[PDB]
Each structure stands twice: as C-alpha cells, then as structure tokens.
Amino acid sequence: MSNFINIHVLISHSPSCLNRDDMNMQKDAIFGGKRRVRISSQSLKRAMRKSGYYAQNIGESSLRTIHLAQLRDVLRQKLGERFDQKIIDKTLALLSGKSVDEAEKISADAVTPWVVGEIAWFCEQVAKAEADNLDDKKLLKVLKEDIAAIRVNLQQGVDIALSGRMATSGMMTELGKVDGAMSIAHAITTHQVDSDIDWFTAVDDLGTQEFSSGVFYRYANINLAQLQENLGGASREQALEIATHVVHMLATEVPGAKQRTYAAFNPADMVMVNFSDMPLSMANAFEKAVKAKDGFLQPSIQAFNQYWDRVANGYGLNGAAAQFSLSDVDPITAQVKQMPTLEQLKSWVRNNGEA
C-alpha cells in the first residue's frame, strides 16, 4: 500500500501549433542548456478535461467561469425543476459572496470551477435550513462540521478533485477549498528541437533527426490518499480507476486537432507507472539532451531506462513498477513487470500493481 502513483510517459507527436504564447510562438523551456519545446501543464490538464475519453470514462467536467449572472441563468435552467428559483439564487449568493439579482452583469473575483451537482447539494442544505429556521451563520457552522459530505459531490467534478480549487469569497472560502491530488509537470522534449547544426562549417562538407515529430516527456503523479479524501472518502479502487484513466489520457492526448504521430499503428509510445512513498520525476534522464539515432524515440527510451536503473538502485526503490514499450531497447534491469499492450498496463494499475 504505497500512497503515490507515478506516471512517466514518452509521447511522440508534432512539435508545432500545440501551445503558443502571446506572440504566435510555440512555448519552450531551457533544460540542461538546451531549448526544448514545451506544452504547459494548464494546457495538458484542460486538454484532458475536455477530451472525449474523459467525457466517456470520468464524467462531466467542471464549469469554470467568472460570470455569475450567466451561471445564474444556467443554474436556473438546469435546476429550476428541482428547487424554487429563489433557493437557487440564495445558494449561488451564499457560495459566491455576491448578490444575485436580475442584473445583466455580476462578476466573481476570479474564474472559479463550479460543479453543478455540488451546487444542487448546497441548494438542498439551504432549503432545508429555511424549513428549519436556521440563519446563514449556523448554516455555515454546521456545514463546516461534515465536509466529506460536500466532497462526495466532486465525483461529478473529478477534474477538481484532481487539480484543486481555491475560493476568495462566499461560503466556499471555508467549504470550497480543495487541495489537488494530481501533480503534473510541463511536457518537455527529451531532445533539442532546433536543428543541431552550424550552417557555416556545414556548407564545406556538402543518427538522423526528426522534424515533423518530437519526443516529449510527461510526468504526473497522483496522491491516492488525497484523491480518496477529495472524493468524499471513496475507496482505493475508485482512486485507482481514475488514476488509470489519467495514465491513459496522459499517454495519448495531444492538445488541438493533432494527435500522436503513430496514432493509427500503436496505442502509446512508451509508458511506465510506478508506485512509491515519495513522488519522484524522471526528467533528469534528459538533462543531457538526447541525440538522434533512428529518430529520437528509442534513444530516449534508452536514456529513461538507464536513469531508472541508476536512481532505483541508488535510492533503493522497491515499490511496484510496470512498463509498456514495444521498442527493443536494452531492457530495464530492475523488477519492472513488462506489459505486452497498453490495456494490460491499465489493468495493472487498476489492480494496485499485482495483476
């Protein structure tokens, strides 16, 4: 029973039109002295969130906004048959800290994530309080007593239980603070994307590099205890189910229309999952930027494996570990159960690292 599960992913896809800044340029980042192409974790997260896989296997995603008026209209249309409009308005008002009239514009302090199931639950508590002659103050007081009952509703807002939420006003300041379970890094390429060439000297002499594809390292880990808590006390099984869908999405999703370069042929380029007591990232396997052989993918896997060996042996990691890669690279010595397909890896995660 280890508390952290670490997801290491090597993914091969285009290095362009993925994640741009304010000036039409693809994001990047310097690592080990070389410029890598970067996809930013906000982008990853939101790409996963709005993905179809998520919609079909996790649920509906949170409703993030700053427009309380329009949220008011939405909540009326979506809950209006179940509570009276006045109870809805009261509830949104108590949670946001703003007055809900029928004005045209009502802004919160910041863009906040909203779960409609959660809001509905609160509507229940508000209406019940109204029938029970409770003032807002002891309402807040009693709600503070059982929070897990509020977190149960995050099973309809899993993205929030995963990546967290802060509130600055309303009752949400004491009932709505959620500490995210999943930590996720920025995707960085394992290699330099600028062509490794001095064009001056080169013109005298008139591994092979890829250009329309690049190899990215994605790291994420999930704090199971934390996920269970944020979900209102759900079981380690439900945890592991969600963590599994995250291993999948992390291993497969590319922001925008684009997808993995070899999407139609294999299901994943390289994936390793590893249970542990303390999270640790493998990015340092690429501090020394990878140099091409037949492209960048298997020299990257080679690096990943060599480093995994040295770290595991050095720091004494005897937690469960599984890896999926259909490349024949020199094998990874430690007790790392190899997985023939992706799905088998996913089922190995679903089963707490034994299947």
Binding site: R76, Q77, G80, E81, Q85
Partner: protein
Amino acid sequence: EIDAMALYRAWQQLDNGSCAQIRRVSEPDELRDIPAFYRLVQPFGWENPRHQQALLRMVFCLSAGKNVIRHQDKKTGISLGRALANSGRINERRIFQLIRADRTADMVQLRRLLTHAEPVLDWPLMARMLTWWGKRERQQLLEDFVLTTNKN
C-alpha cells in the same frame, strides 16, 4: 429574455382551427389543457419554467382574437394604459375594477378590455408588463390611462 415580437408574428400566422381552439380558454392556466398552445409556445422557451407564467399571460391576451392587439413600432412606445385610453371605448371604472381584481380574474378582465378596445400599442412593452405584472405594474397602468385621458 423571451422574444415577444416573434410570438406575436407567430400568433398572427396561426391556422384558424388552432387559433379558434386557443381562444376558447376562459382562464390562462387552461392553456395547459390545449395541445395547440404547446405547439405554439414551444419555440419561445416554454420548456424553461421561468418563462411559463409569462408565456401563459402573453398568449392569453393575444387570444383575444387574431388581430385584436395591433402592434405599432415606437418613433418606449405606446403603453397599455395609453392605448386603452386612446381607444375611447374603455370607461375609467373598468381600469379601476381591473387593478383591484384578484389573481387570474384580473387577466380575464384584461382580455375582455382588449377585445372591446382593439388597442394599438408597443407589443413587447406590454409583453414585459405582463412578464412582471405586480402591484407596481397595475398602478402604472391606471396612471398612464388617467394622464392620457386628461389631455385627450
């Protein structure tokens, strides 16, 4: 918000059987007993409860006849009280009688007035008035009427 001119033009183009079938109600809520009504107000958000008690009123009034309420564009246009006063067919005491009438009875009186006067007015303005329809709005009605009747 709920489109009002749309609904107006909808009513106006309705088929005679339908219109004749809706006209038969004698109380707004009875519209919920009539299929044609639902077919009419489906596009204008009847499915959203917030609007229902509004739609019910709007339609009820329109149900005075196919061209009883005559909409005229503004050059705030012409208010209901203004119009009823302009007609010259409404005695003041019926507005009196209307603004002290109870729930539902008020609307019945209103529709009767509409059929008697055949007013010319800014339909969406009336639409909003019906949308809220409280003590405020009734008082506003009587005031518009009085102030008009004085000058004319």
